[PDB]
Design a protein around this ligand. Structure first.
Ligand code: 1BC
Ligand code: NA
Ligand code: NA
Ligand code: ZN
Ligand code: ZN
Ligand code: ZN
Length: 374
């Protein structure tokens, strides 16, 4: 399973999955921020291949549609089940739910080389509801595959059912999964070049913090975004950038190989430790957040953006790390990645005697209160 992913942060990382019999092998974007297995199932300007239900003798229609809006764009399709296997994964075959995407807007991107998404988060956020069993749950229930996977994103490995120690150096540090819906976690402190942002720590997790391989950027709640930008600007104040750059709408450039990296600070996110009163920190390099895209110059985009739905630790963040989704023990581990040429660091423990609760409790809507989970 080592080396079983390909891709980049701008357009995502995909694993090979074989669906149906006779086998159709598809390139699937790995998405820890959703819970549907969904695959393009009809021609599209941007698809190199798609799922042909009519070629699969093992496909079964569920006779139910599903409509998945996103803030900008959407997919919809028909639910069914089919046999699924992972060529560079364990030696098993499962029957899983698959949404056959028949229409979409702004979902498939020009030249991505993936045809489908593998939603690895939990059933609570599956569409249309939590009774549509996500792929990984079907995988574990059907086989004896251990209930964990890891992502090493460089190009990359998703190891299913195991930790591979050749993919990381140093210590593996675990933070609890706060609740099993998204891969929710809790941020206890943020430093930018050594300086504490000094916000009430609930602000860092307002209204949640998650780990999301389907998101490119580090995304931060409004007040936290504003504080970080103020701090990164202060550090880089010998360069005056236009506003569009800080909005992630404009490149900024230096002559080939002369970029003043030192003017850009490191960002440390302190995650809750498994032990009470402890945390550990993941330290993010400017090379993660300031990404190359005037082809005599080196030009870059700012990959930190504002959020109204919480902190999102996206691909630009996970790229520096071996990240273990240890669902069995309800925790997420981080270690420094062994793919490379300041380093992204994973460091701890940090003890706080001050034992604060930094999680935010999302106000409970009547609709949410109404639902039974039997
Ligand atoms: C690391 C992989 C990131 C990827 S792969 C393909 C795209 C994409 C962009 N537009 N259409 C597809 C992105 C950017 C990402 N947006 C998306 N991620 C996905 C998971 C595929 C779900 C989705 C549905 C729609 Cl309808 C539009 C965008 C996205 C995203 N990144 C951010 O930084 C902020 C918001 N969305
Ligand atoms: Na099934
Ligand atoms: Na389509
Ligand atoms: Zn093609
Ligand atoms: Zn009931
Ligand atoms: Zn339920």
């Amino acid at each position: 399973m080592v080396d079983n992913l390909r891709g980049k942060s701008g357009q995502g990382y995909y694993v090979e999955m074989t669906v149906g019999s006779p086998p159709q092998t598809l390139n699937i974007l790995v998405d820890t921020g959703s819970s549907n297995f969904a695959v393009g199932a009809a021609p599209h300007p941007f698809l190199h291949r798609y799922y042909q239900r009519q070629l699969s003798s093992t496909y079964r229609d569920l006779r139910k549609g599903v409509y998945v809006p996103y803030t900008q764009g959407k997919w919809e399709g028909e639910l069914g089940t089919d046999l699924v296997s992972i060529p560079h994964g364990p030696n098993v075959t499962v029957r899983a739910n698959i949404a056959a995407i028949t229409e979409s807007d702004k979902f498939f991107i020009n030249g991505s080389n993936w045809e489908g998404i593998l939603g690895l988060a939990y059933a609570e956020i599956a569409r249309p509801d939590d009774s549509l069993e996500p792929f990984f749950d079907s995988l574990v229930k059907q086989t004896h595959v251990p209930n964990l996977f890891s992502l090493q994103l460089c190009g990359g490995s998703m190891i299913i059912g195991g930790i591979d120690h050749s993919l990381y150096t140093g210590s593996l540090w675990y933070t609890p999964i706060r609740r099993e819906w998204y891969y929710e976690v809790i941020i206890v402190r943020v430093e930018i070049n050594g300086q504490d942002l000094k916000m009430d720590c609930k602000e860092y997790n307002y209204d949640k913090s998650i780990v999301d391989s389907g998101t490119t950027n580090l995304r931060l709640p409004k007040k936290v975004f504003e504080a970080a930008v103020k701090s990164i600007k202060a550090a880089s104040s010998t360069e005056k950038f236009p506003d569009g750059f800080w909005l992630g709408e404009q490149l900024v450039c230096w002559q080939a190989g002369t970029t003043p990296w030192n003017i850009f600070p490191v960002i440390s996110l302190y995650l809750m430790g498994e032990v009470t009163n402890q945390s550990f920190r993941i330290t993010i390099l400017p090379q993660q957040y300031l990404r190359p895209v005037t082809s005599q110059d080196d030009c870059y985009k700012f990959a930190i953006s504002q959020s109204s739905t919480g902190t999102v630790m996206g691909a630009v963040i996970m790229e520096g790390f071996y990240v273990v989704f240890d669902r069995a023990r309800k925790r997420i581990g981080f270690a420094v990645s062994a793919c490379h040429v300041r380093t992204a660091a994973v460091e701890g423990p940090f003890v706080t005697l001050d034992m604060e609760d930094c999680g935010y409790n999302i106000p409970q809507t009547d609709e949410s209160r109404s639902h039974h989970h039997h």
